[PDB]
Amino acid sequence: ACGLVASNLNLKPGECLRVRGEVAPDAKSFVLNLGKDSNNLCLHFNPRFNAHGDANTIVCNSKDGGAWGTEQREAVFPFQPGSVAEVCITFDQANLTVKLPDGYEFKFPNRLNLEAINYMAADGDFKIKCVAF
Amino acid sequence: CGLVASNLNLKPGECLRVRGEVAPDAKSFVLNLGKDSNNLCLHFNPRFNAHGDANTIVCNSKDGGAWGTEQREAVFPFQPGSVAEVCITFDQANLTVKLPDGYEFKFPNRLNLEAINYMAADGDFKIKCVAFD
Ligand SMILES: C#CCO[C@H]1[C@@H](O)[C@@H](CO)O[C@@H](O[C@H]2[C@H](O)[C@@H](NC(C)=O)[C@H](OCC=C)O[C@@H]2CO)[C@@H]1O
Ligand SMILES: C#CCO[C@H]1[C@@H](O)[C@@H](CO)O[C@@H](O[C@H]2[C@H](O)[C@@H](NC(C)=O)[C@H](OCC=C)O[C@@H]2CO)[C@@H]1O
Distance B51 CA to ligand 1 centre (A): 52
> For residue B2, what are the contacts with CB-CB under 8 A and spacing of at least 6?
A8, B120, B121, B122, B123, B125, B126, B127
Q: Provide the CB-side half-sphere exposure for B129 (13 A, CA).
A: 14
Distance A75 CA to ligand 1 centre (A): 17
CA distance B76 to B85: 13
Q: Which domains does chain B have, with CATH numbers?
A: 1-133 (2.60.120.200)
Distance A30 CA to ligand 1 centre (A): 13
Compute CA distances A20 → A29, A116, A119, A131, B117, whole Å: 15, 21, 17, 7, 19
Nearest CA to ligand 2 atom 1: B67
**Contact state of A7 with B4 under an 8 Å Cβ cutoff:** yes
How buried is B21 (Cβ within 10 angstroms: 0-12 exposed, 13-18 middle, 19+ buried)?
A: middle
CA distance A67 to A49: 25
Distance B15 CA to ligand 2 centre (A): 28
CA angle B6, B22, B77 (to 5 degrees): 100
Contact between B116 and B7 under an 8 Å Cβ cutoff? The reply is no
CB of residue A33 inside a 6 A radius of ligand 1: no
Contact between B58 and B70 under an 8 Å Cβ cutoff? The reply is yes
Nearest CA to ligand 1 atom 30: A68
Question: What SS3 string covers chain B?
Answer: CCCEEEEEEECCCCCEEEEEEECCCCCEEEEEEEEECCEEEEEEEEEEEECCEEEEEEEEEEECCEECCCEECCCCCCCCCEEEEEEEEECCCEEEEECHHHCEEEEECCCCCCCEEEEEEEECEEEEEEEEC
How buried is A53 (Cβ within 10 angstroms: 0-12 exposed, 13-18 middle, 19+ buried)?
A: exposed
CA distance B133 to B120: 19
Residues with CB under 6 A from ligand 2: B 43, 45, 51-53, 58, 60, 67, 70
> By C-alpha distance, which of B26, B28, B38 is closest to B81?
B26
Q: From the CA of B104, how many Å to the nearest CA of chain A? A: 23
Q: Which ligand has an atom closest to residue B65 CA?
A: 2
Resolution reading in Å: 1.2
CB of residue A48 inside a 6 A radius of ligand 1: no
CB of residue A68 inside a 6 A radius of ligand 1: yes
Nearest CA to ligand 2 atom 15: B51
Q: Could you tell me which residues are beta bridge partners of residue A41?
A: A35, A63
Question: What SS3 string covers chain A?
Answer: CEEEEEEEEEECCCCCEEEEEEECCCCCEEEEEEEEECCEEEEEEEEEEEECCEEEEEEEEEEECCEECCCEECCCCCCCCCEEEEEEEEECCCEEEEECHHHCEEEEECCCCCCCEEEEEEEECEEEEEEEC
Q: Which ligand has an atom closest to residue A60 CA?
A: 1
Q: Which residues between 45 and 104 in chain A have a beta carbon less than 8 angstroms from any beta carbon of chain B?
A: none
